[PDB]
Amino acid sequence: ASIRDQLHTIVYRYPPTYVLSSEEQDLVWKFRFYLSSHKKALTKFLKCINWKLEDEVTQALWMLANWAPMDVEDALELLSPTFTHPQVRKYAVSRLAQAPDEDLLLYLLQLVQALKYEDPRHIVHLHGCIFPANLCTFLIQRACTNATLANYFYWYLSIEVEERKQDERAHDMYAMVLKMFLKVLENGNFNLRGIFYNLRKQRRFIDELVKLVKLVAKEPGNRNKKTEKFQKLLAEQDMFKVNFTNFEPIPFPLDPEIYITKIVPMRTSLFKSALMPAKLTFVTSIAHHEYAAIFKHGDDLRQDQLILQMITLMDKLLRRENLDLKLTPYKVLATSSKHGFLQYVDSCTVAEVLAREGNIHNFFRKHHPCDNGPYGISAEVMDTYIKSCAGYCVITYLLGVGDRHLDNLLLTTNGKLFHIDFGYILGRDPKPMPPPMKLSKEMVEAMGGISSEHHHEFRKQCYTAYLHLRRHANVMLNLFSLMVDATVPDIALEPDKAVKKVEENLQLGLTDEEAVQHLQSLLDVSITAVMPALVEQIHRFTQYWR
Amino acid sequence: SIRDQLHTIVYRYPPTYVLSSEEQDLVWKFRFYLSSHKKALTKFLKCINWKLEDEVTQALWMLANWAPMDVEDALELLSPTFTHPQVRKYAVSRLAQAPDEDLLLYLLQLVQALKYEDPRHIVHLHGCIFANLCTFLIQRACTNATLANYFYWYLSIEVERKQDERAHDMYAMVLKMFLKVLENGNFNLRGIFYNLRKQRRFIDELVKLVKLVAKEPGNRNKKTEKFQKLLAEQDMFKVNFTNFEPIPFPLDPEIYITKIVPMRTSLFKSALMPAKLTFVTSIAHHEYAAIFKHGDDLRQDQLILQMITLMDKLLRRENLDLKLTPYKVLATSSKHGFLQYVDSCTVAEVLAREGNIHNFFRKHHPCDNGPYGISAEVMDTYIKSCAGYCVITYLLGVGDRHLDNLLLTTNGKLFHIDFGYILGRDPKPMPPPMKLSKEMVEAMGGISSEHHHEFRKQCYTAYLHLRRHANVMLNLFSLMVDATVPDIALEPDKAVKKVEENLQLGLTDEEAVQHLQSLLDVSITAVMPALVEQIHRFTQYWRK
Numbered sequence A: 001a002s003i004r005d006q007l008h009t010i011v012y013r014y015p016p017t018y019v020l021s022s023e024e025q026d027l028v029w030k031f032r033f034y035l036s037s038h039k040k041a042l043t044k045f046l047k048c049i050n051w052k053l054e055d056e057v058t059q060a061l062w063m064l065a066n067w068a069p070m071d072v073e074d075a076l077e078l079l080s081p082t083f084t085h086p087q088v089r090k091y092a093v094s095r096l097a098q099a100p101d102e103d104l105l106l107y108l109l110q111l112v113q114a115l116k117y118e119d120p121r122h123i124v125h126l127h128g129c130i131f132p133a134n135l136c137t138f139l140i141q142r143a144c145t146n147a148t149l150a151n152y153f154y155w156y157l158s159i160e161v162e163e164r165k166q167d168e169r170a171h172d173m174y175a176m177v178l179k180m181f182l183k184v185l186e187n188g189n190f191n192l193r194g195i196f197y198n199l200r201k202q203r204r205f206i207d208e209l210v211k212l213v214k215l216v217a218k219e220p221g222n223r224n225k226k227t228e229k230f231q232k233l234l235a236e237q238d239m240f241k242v243n244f245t246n247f248e249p250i251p252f253p254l255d256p257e258i259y260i261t262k263i264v265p266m267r268t269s270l271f272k273s274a275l276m277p278a279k280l281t282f283v284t285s286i287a288h289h290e291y292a293a294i295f296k297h298g299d300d301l302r303q304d305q306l307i308l309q310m311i312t313l314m315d316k317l318l319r320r321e322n323l324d325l326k327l328t329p330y331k332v333l334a335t336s337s338k339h340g341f342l343q344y345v346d347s348c349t350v351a352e353v354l355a356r357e358g359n360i361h362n363f364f365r366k367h368h369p370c371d372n373g374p375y376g377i378s379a380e381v382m383d384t385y386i387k388s389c390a391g392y393c394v395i396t397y398l399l400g401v402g403d404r405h406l407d408n409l410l411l412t413t414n415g416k417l418f419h420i421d422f423g424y425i426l427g428r429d430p431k432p433m434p435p436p437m438k439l440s441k442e443m444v445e446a447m448g449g450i451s452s453e454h455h456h457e458f459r460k461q462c463y464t465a466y467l468h469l470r471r472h473a474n475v476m477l478n479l480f481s482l483m484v485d486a487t488v489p490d491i492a493l494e495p496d497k498a499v500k501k502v503e504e505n506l507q508l509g510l511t512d513e514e515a516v517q518h519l520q521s522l523l524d525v526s527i528t529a530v531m532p533a534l535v536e537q538i539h540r541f542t543q544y545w546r
Numbered sequence B: 001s002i003r004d005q006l007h008t009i010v011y012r013y014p015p016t017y018v019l020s021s022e023e024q025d026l027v028w029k030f031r032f033y034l035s036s037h038k039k040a041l042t043k044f045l046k047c048i049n050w051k052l053e054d055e056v057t058q059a060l061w062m063l064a065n066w067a068p069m070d071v072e073d074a075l076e077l078l079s080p081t082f083t084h085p086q087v088r089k090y091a092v093s094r095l096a097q098a099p100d101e102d103l104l105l106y107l108l109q110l111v112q113a114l115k116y117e118d119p120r121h122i123v124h125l126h127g128c129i130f131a132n133l134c135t136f137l138i139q140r141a142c143t144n145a146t147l148a149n150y151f152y153w154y155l156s157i158e159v160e161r162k163q164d165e166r167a168h169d170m171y172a173m174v175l176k177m178f179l180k181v182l183e184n185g186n187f188n189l190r191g192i193f194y195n196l197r198k199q200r201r202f203i204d205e206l207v208k209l210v211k212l213v214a215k216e217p218g219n220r221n222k223k224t225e226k227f228q229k230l231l232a233e234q235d236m237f238k239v240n241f242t243n244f245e246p247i248p249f250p251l252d253p254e255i256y257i258t259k260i261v262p263m264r265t266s267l268f269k270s271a272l273m274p275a276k277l278t279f280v281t282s283i284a285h286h287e288y289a290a291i292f293k294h295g296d297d298l299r300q301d302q303l304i305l306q307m308i309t310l311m312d313k314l315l316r317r318e319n320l321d322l323k324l325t326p327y328k329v330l331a332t333s334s335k336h337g338f339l340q341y342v343d344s345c346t347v348a349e350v351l352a353r354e355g356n357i358h359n360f361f362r363k364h365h366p367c368d369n370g371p372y373g374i375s376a377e378v379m380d381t382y383i384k385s386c387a388g389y390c391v392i393t394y395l396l397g398v399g400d401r402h403l404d405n406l407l408l409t410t411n412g413k414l415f416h417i418d419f420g421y422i423l424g425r426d427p428k429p430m431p432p433p434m435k436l437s438k439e440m441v442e443a444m445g446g447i448s449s450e451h452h453h454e455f456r457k458q459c460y461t462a463y464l465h466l467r468r469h470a471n472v473m474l475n476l477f478s479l480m481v482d483a484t485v486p487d488i489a490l491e492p493d494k495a496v497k498k499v500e501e502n503l504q505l506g507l508t509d510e511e512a513v514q515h516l517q518s519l520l521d522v523s524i525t526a527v528m529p530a531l532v533e534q535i536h537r538f539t540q541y542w543r544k
Ligand SMILES: COc1ccc2c(nc(NC(=O)c3cccnc3)[n+]3cc[nH]c23)c1OC
Pocket: A271, A273, A294, A304, A330, A342, A343, A344, A345, A346, A347, A348, A349, A407, A410, A420, A421, A422
């Protein structure tokens, strides 16, 4: 029938972590031979066969070789811990190889995590080959071809390697992977050797930077005294193995593409933030262009990088759809945990804006005034602000960010708001009862209250964003499937529910009409609870029945 | 082409529109051709009379040829907007085709519509007694006996500003003529006429007696005992109340009445006090109970009941039996009427009597396996009745709801009793947009309940259906502009405009549903004490 396939389009193309396929498995088994439709299909057939019969393997493997080729994102799942079979894993690696480098970088964090799942004997056989395509040989081969990839690959492995349970099994494995990668570069040729020297430079440079930060932390003083001490140390030359006011050009670790040269001491500040991170500036190799970054000594950033990848990727997904909310997905890396960098975007924390200029409208109006509309605020600015908001409420909801407040959100003079400091993930909040959506009175007034052409514009935008994201779920879920054993604090409290929790937020059961209605619901409770008048109005309604 | 869809939007959607005034006369080129469908016609007419001498002759040829009319268009054409005598003739030829039952519903508005010109038609007929509109109403009035009844009483309230004086004059001509055509008739007319006389004589007699129960001061009990002896004592009024000749009940013509029963009459708790009397039906010593109220003009309430009745019919033709109860109401004159009475307890009553609503349903219809010890279908009739009434209340902007206002039957239907406040008007400062007792929602089993989800689902679909049949209601209300209902009178112009916002026709259906959900959410949390406490904690969050 058509009803026969109608049952199948639902299964071929709905969730990638459902067990649900039970009797259904056999239905696919037979139509499978006739219609190996698309890449989407292959992921589903694989799930049922391998483990139970020794012979099934032979028939399915032949199907896979002929099958319409899997998409890189669907391929990720195969590297998951659920699929053991050595033959299918090789296939996934072949899919990755076909993908362009830009795509490889997004996932790289996941792939590094993926190493655990891939079998130990593959890692040791290679070690034997060097010292006295399987995935891991592959990651190294590619890391070497392209300099930026080498940089990221190195920094991810390095966080893993530094110093119990399963931790010994994985630390030992990663330690080994890194040693092999460094030995391949030391040996390679000009280009490979060249990569090796630049890493050496990055590594040496940070240690000196870290040494310096540690001296600043010791000397006692309020922030201002501490920052003055910081300015002086950088400008002290030959106190340090690297001399800051000038050095030899180093590929910035945060961005390999840009070299640095010097740092400018006067331009460096420290943040109000309770862990006291520097801003730094550098000049860089071309026409003394500034760059700044932050550099943070007190926390581990691994969790923050994961979320930023999550935001970075989501923005890409919507931009492909031609939905562009002006989100800022700033670069994080951590170095070895407890330090890291972050890209700095010029912005102002919301609370700063409110203390310094009465309300948000005044602030845009100051930077971008246009008498006519909408608020004497240049039209675009308003629009970009509306869009940035929609983008974040939906993105925050899916990732269950919590512990948001005025210190945590910022504005820009263009308009965008963005978030920062995702210390609390997947519904952990220090307060007993978060609102489902995280908006502020200050922010809603920015839109003009409930009927604004503008507020209506915002809700509409969230709905379309939510719907678009629901569609691209498979990619996000597999990426989380791969962070099970991640060593992100928020994930570790219950790793099993890590992926289960994002699925619930995604609300994949419901129809589109239903999904919007459900989301619509969350915004409303949150906005009513935020607005002073809306609560007065509800008290009045309670009063009506007396 | 692509104009094919944009065409169908002006056919199926817009109900009364300025929209595209330059575009009014541009649909014209492709208009001669797609005259093929019925609804098109109503829109066709809105544009052509706007210019002087010439379109006129060509458009009727278009009109006479046009795919024929649904009755609803016709309501639009009787209205004060379309002035042309042919189109009004046309509208009447449409009415002619409608079955009597339909004329019954629209009948109330039709009496009103006659209020629009031409006066010349009525004075010509006056010169003619001593199918234009009035002539039509009369002639059909005589055709049907139940119909004739309603017509008469509707006119009689109206004859009982400086332009309330001019139409009143017109109304008297129309009533008197009707009565004159009745005397002159063949047997059956005179039979109806005679009946109308009997009815009046009787009403005036009950009125004087009723006047004599209020004239006496004292306790509520003293006035009811007085009421029993007044009806008991034969022949002090020329109509004898413990027995008289078979009369067709004025409120409901089909039932015949012999007498009242005095021991059965009781008097209600309200400050201005309504009586509940039993009557006997001419047939089978069956009884019919009703209420007779002495205080106010009931024209407002009857309008709402027409509306309820109308809405139920549409939904039932949709096979949503929402289990509405639309009891019959008639105003005899301003300050007296009859209301069908339906056995029921008022919610507040049900609550003193039983802790909560389930106990009540549980006592009358218990089943051990039925959801909350009740027959599954009793709970269902309840959910559905609730749903209907939240939607209907909403479109109609009924305010003043409280627990003496909402009655409940032993069977489960919920219904609203009293309609002093319409189209938003409410004594209280802020109405909730939807009216739900805490007690009503606990009766569902809380926001948690499955039944509660069925409740909500029912409201959206009810709402969606009624939206589809907007045209019918909007025309009916357009004819109620100069109505004499207190709440249209305050803002006559804006009155019709208010129902039209409730329908929210601007919105596509996903949007419409959404909007409605919103109203329900507000109103429900407001009532629940735990949902409020939760809004409280969220408020607490940003604060710090
Ligand atoms: C004026 O204050 C800030 C301006 C820009 C900032 C900004 N902070 C940023 N990052 C953070 O301070 C941060 C802390 C902890 C974990 N993740 C991020 N950050 C990342 C990209 N742009 C910015 C400012 O401090 C409130």
